[PDB]
């Protein structure tokens, strides 16, 4: 019941990932990001900013439990927000969400 663990590590060794948010939002901008990620513990202003910009153009996002499960699951210690750039692997995680 956590198989998106693995497949965002997938995406990441596939160079499908982004991390950060400036390197995310520049994704989103680009129409590149397909999926973004963020933590439930990610800051206020954080978690509005990059909402809003994925509300803004319509790219769907999704939010995971800590910033120490994200990092994890990408091989780091801890990631706030990533952007997946590749449909196909942003569609099968978001059924896994
Ligand atoms: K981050």
Same mark, same amino acid.
């Given at each position: ?14 160079? !499908? %990932?982004? $991390?950060?948010?400036? *390197? ?6 680009? =129409? #590149? ?29 999704? !939010? %995971?439990? $800590?910033?120490?499960? *994200? ?6 210690? =801890? #990631? ?18």
């Amino acid at each position: 019941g956590m198989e998106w663990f693995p497949l965002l590590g997938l995406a990441n060794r596939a160079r !499908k %990932v982004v $991390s950060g948010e400036d *390197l995310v939002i520049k994704e989103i901008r680009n =129409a #590149r990001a397909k999926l973004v990620l963020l933590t439930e513990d990610a800051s206020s202003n954080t978690a509005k900013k990059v909402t809003d910009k994925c509300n803004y153009y319509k790219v769907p996002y999704k !939010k %995971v439990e $800590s910033r120490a499960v *994200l990092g994890r699951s990408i091989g780091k210690e =801890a #990631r706030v927000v990533v952007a997946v750039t590749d449909q196909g692997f942003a569609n099968k995680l978001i059924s896994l969400l």
